[PDB]
């Protein structure tokens, strides 16, 4: 009985392969060969937000494109005024082992989580002037790896226990739970319209989730090893994924298959962030080799190299205005590049 | 601007507070703690932090065994630990694969391991009833406490390959206070080694 189900699943996967291959009437390069390159896109260090005591593990940009929140295993989530380097808040964490953070679109809330298996929703605009935990969201069986806000109330989270979940910070309960990965769900990225999101798992597969259905919609694959970071293309019809296999791939949602593979024989180090620029021409991948390598997303070749860290980069958040790209790193210096 | 200047004052107050907290934290010594299930750790839901003080040091021990996840994805957090305390239930000896994995992990080739063989008395009494061949068929020697203990001790240390680190094996009967002194002096030797490395001299 079980063997019949396994055979039918194999037949279904074969049909997936056949249908995906039939639609591949061209490659991205075969069309983009008529397009001129961006040339040498050199970028330089404008500022350097010093002040973390240890390795920085996450950074996120406020929707106003000025405040940036950084989280480090020193146990402090500090909010930076990026135009003046002034530190605005120094939030003490209940545990030092933070691995992700998020800045709410309204700017009212700052999320934080890590090996605690608990996601803390800090409230910034408290009447008493201090910043205090609003909720301590709990229920994952493993470390919360990445979290993002859809609005001030409901936060989506991704955890090492092969699950992504959608919370309500108004009640602390899960409104919906997403399951289906085999490995740890290392990273997550919400689409620009927040109607749906993608997550990359340590089983080298990336999935498309629908927050209102509560179920998967499409599944993507193609890296040899775990996906470390993932981010939507700003048009909402594609997303880039960066694996530990020292390559970044661009997956089209409507074409249901990988379109391009950014890699270079000099590279052996794993990816750690795959954020785009606002026009989508530039994919500012960040590498464990201490460098951020800007790939021209359509010509599929290197546009430039950004360097300066004495240790691996942990984030490559691009401002919502496209004005600057921040790069936190394990040497505690969150440089601002523009 | 008479508004921005007060924000600048706020930034230099909280920067000072960050520096003071860092100075306070610098006195602690962080040790990772590992071992098999029920294997001696308890005698000596997420991360289980525990801490103590000895000779004005403030040792922090992390029992990370609660993480039901691949080591590879979170072990990089502990890249900065001073030492790894590894425990073995000698009365059992299946942990050698875990030791092999953790000793040559990409992040720990420079971090020395402290290795407590634990429940040694139960092992000695078991030797009077079962040969060491039962947990190690390859064993070639007499059935006695001292030789079997030395054998498994060398067997654990034989897993290291990188010369950049040392294994400070030790034995405990889980009925003595000597554990704190042993860890303190081993950590003192470890810190001296790290200091000599920093001087470009080690």
């Amino acid at each position: 009985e079980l063997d019949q189900l396994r055979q039918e699943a194999e037949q279904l996967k074969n049909q997936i392969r056949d249908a995906r291959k039939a639609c591949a009437d061209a490659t991205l390069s075969q069309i983009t060969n008529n397009i001129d390159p961006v040339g040498r896109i050199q970028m330089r260090t404008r500022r350097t937000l010093r002040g973390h005591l240890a390795k920085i593990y996450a950074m996120h940009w406020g929707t106003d494109s000025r405040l940036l929140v950084s989280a480090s295993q020193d146990g402090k989530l500090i909010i930076w005024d990026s135009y003046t380097t002034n530190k605005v808040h120094a939030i003490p964490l209940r545990s030092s082992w933070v691995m992700t953070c998020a800045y709410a679109p309204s700017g009212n809330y700052v999320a934080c989580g890590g090996l605690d298996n608990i996601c803390s929703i800090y409230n910034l605009k408290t009447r008493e002037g201090n910043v205090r935990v609003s909720r301590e969201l709990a229920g994952h069986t493993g470390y919360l790896s990445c979290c993002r806000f859809l609005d001030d109330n409901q936060i989506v989270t991704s955890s090492g226990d092969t699950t992504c979940a959608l919370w309500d910070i108004e009640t602390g309960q899960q409104t919906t739970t997403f399951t289906g990965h085999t490995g740890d769900v290392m990273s997550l990225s919400l689409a620009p319209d927040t109607r749906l999101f993608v997550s990359g798992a340590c089983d080298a597969s990336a999935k498309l989730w629908d927050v209102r259905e509560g179920m998967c919609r499409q599944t993507f694959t193609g890296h040899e090893s775990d996906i470390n970071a993932i981010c939507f293309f700003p048009n909402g019809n594609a997303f880039a994924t960066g694996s530990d296999d020292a390559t970044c791939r661009l997956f089209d949602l409507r074409a249901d298959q990988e379109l391009m593979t950014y890699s270079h024989d000099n590279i052996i180090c794993g990816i750690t962030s795959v954020s785009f620029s606002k026009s989508g021409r530039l994919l500012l991948a960040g590498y464990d080799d201490f460098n951020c390598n800007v790939w021209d997303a359509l010509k599929a070749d290197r546009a430039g190299v950004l360097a300066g860290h004495d240790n691996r980069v942990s984030c490559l958040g691009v401002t919502d205005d496209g004005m600057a790209v921040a790069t936190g790193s394990w040497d505690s210096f969150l440089k601002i590049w523009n | 601007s008479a508004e921005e200047r007060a924000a600048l004052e706020r930034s230099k107050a909280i920067e000072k507070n960050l520096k003071e907290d860092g100075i306070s934290a610098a006195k602690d010594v962080k040790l990772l703690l590992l071992g098999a299930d029920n294997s001696g750790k308890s005698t000596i839901t997420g991360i289980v932090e525990t801490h103590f003080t000895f000779k004005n040091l403030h040792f922090r021990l992390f029992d990370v065994g609660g993480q039901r996840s691949e080591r590879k994805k979170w072990i990089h957090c502990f890249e900065d630990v001073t030492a790894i305390i590894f425990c073995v239930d000698l009365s059992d000896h299946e942990s050698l694969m875990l030791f092999d994995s953790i000793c040559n992990n990409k992040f720990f080739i420079d971090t020395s391991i402290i290795l407590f063989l634990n429940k040694k008395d139960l092992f000695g009494e078991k030797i009077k009833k079962s040969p060491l061949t039962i947990c190690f068929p390859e064993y070639t020697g007499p059935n006695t406490y001292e030789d079997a203990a030395a054998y498994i001790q060398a067997q654990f240390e034989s897993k290291n390959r990188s010369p950049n680190k040392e294994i400070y094996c030790h034995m405990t009967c889980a009925t003595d206070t000597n554990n704190a002194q042993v860890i303190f002096d081993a950590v003192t030797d470890i810190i001296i080694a790290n200091n000599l490395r920093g001087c470009g001299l080690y």
Partner: single-chain antibody
Amino acid sequence: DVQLVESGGGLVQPGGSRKLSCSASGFAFSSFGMHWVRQAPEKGLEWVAYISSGSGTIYYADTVKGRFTISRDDPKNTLFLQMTSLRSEDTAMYYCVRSIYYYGSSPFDFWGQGTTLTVSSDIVMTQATSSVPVTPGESVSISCRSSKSLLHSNGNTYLYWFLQRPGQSPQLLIYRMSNLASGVPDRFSGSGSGTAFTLTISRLEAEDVGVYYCMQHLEYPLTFGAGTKLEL
């Protein structure tokens, strides 16, 4: 709830001395600044003194510098104003005003109840109108002007608007001349640029009767306008 109460008023002989204290509860007093603002018995507000968080910096009004001294006991959540050589002009009700400064912060957001104490080159703020008779349902307008342009080069314009209801302490309504204060209805709206500012009230209700003071924060000492009475 956040609460501020001050004490130490009464009648003092001219030339004497007195200590006024401000007691804070329900908020992180150590991280807030504190100001003193005083009101003559039938006149608009006037500024007195400042003290920053952690006692780092202090400022005084020109009419007061050296006559008063301001200090705070942060662990006791208490601010002190030590006062000497009281002149006939020093009779006023004194309000304790909190403030906190960072990007996106709202200074002067909460005011104490005030203590009646009586005795036996700066930017000048001016309002073109003294009284405006008005009725509910209609819109209302109040306007204020500055001798120097408040729009600093960094893009902030530091005009502030306070509403004082009869028999009560002032409350913040509009800060930095465009932003709406926390907890005030949406009926109010600031506007203007450079040296002229306007506060517009849409669909007025009787709850908004009182005196509206414009204020600048571009430089110390801070200065209040003479106040426009929106009278029912």
